[PDB]
């Protein structure tokens, strides 16, 4: 049985309980905290690519009002984000299970751009999600995992200074 777990969930829970924010920029900004995933139950000798994308958690625009995040009134459908391929992809089951899979080089942008960067809509709430794709074999297979604990609102600057403080404290 293939098992996927969140490394440093205790740190992510500190951010989640304040409402987490991630900066997005024209050229794209790396995430803190970084999504790190513990994986076991892979075939050490099978071939896999690790994919990261971001699900719009709701169809609303959010706004920071008298120090609290509140959803707009007017839902729009949120098309799914583009996928980021972990740069170690493709790789042997063994490679992925020997240390936490770390998405330290994904960059979050608010502008359609060349390559690498994932465009998110500013002031939308997002849930990180991975896909483990078994490649090369005859039977292709995908297993998907969500990380509720890692939810955030995409922002051009931090609104909650409690978030600013946590980011600096643990970076
Ligand atoms: C051009 N390129 C470089 C890498 Cl790496 C990949 C890749 O892993 N593609 C697919 C494997 C199944 C999911 C995405 N494609």
Which residues form ligand 1's pocket by a CB distance below 6 Å?
A: 49, 51, 85, 89-90, 133, 135
State the architecture of 1-171 in CATH terms: Sandwich (2.60)
Experimental technique behind these coordinates:
X-ray
Q: What is the resolution of this structure in A?
A: 2.0
Domain ranges of the chain: 1-171
Gyration radius from the chain CA atoms: 17
For the record, the structure tokens of 168 come out as 């600096």
For the record, the structure tokens of 112 come out as 């359609």
Crossing angle of the two packed helices 161-170 and 9-16, in degrees rounded to 10: 160
Instruction: Calculate how far, in angstroms, residue 108's C-alpha sits from the geometric centre of ligand 1.
Output: 20
The position carrying tokens 């729009």 is 76
71-34-80-5 Cα dihedral, nearest 10 degrees? -100
Instruction: Calculate how far, in angstroms, residue 133's C-alpha sits from the geometric centre of ligand 1.
Output: 9
Instruction: Calculate how far, in angstroms, residue 120's C-alpha sits from the geometric centre of ligand 1.
Output: 21
The position carrying tokens 């960059």 is 107
- Closest residue by Cα to atom 1, ligand 1, is 85
Instruction: Calculate how far, in angstroms, residue 161's C-alpha sits from the geometric centre of ligand 1.
Output: 39
For the chain, list the strands marked E by DSSP.
3-6, 21-23, 29-30, 36-40, 47-56, 62-65, 68-71, 84-85, 91-92, 101-102, 107-109, 118-119, 125-135, 141-146, 152-155
- Closest residue by Cα to atom 5, ligand 1, is 89
CA-based nearest residue to 20, from 119, 146, 148, 107: 148
Q: Are strands 152-155 and 21-23 parallel, antiparallel or unpaired?
A: parallel
The position carrying tokens 């690519």 is 49
Residues 6+ apart with CB under 8 A from 27: 107, 109, 113, 117
Which atom from ligand 1 is nearest to the alpha carbon of 133? Answer: 12
Q: For residues 12 and 117, give the distance between their C-alpha atoms in angstroms, rounded to a whole number.
A: 22
């Amino acid at each position: 049985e293939l098992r996927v777990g969140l490394e440093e969930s205790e740190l992510w829970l500190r951010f989640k309980e304040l409402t987490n924010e991630m900066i997005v920029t024209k050229n794209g900004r790396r995430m803190f905290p970084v999504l790190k995933v513990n994986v076991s139950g892979l075939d050490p000798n099978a071939m896999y690519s690790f994919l990261l994308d971001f699900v719009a958690a709701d169809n609303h625009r959010w706004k920071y009002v008298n120090g609290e995040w509140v959803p707009g009134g007017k839902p729009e459908p949120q098309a799914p984000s583009c996928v980021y391929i972990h740069p170690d992809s493709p790789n042997f089951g063994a490679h992925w299970m020997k240390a936490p899979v770390s998405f330290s080089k994904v960059k979050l942008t608010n502008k359609l751009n060349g390559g690498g960067q994932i465009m998110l809509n500013s002031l939308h709430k997002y849930e990180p999600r991975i896909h483990i794709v078994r490649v090369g074999g005859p039977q292709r297979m995908i297993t998907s995992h969500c990380f509720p604990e890692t939810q955030f609102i995409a922002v051009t600057a931090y609104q909650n200074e409690e978030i600013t403080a946590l980011k600096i404290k643990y970076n």
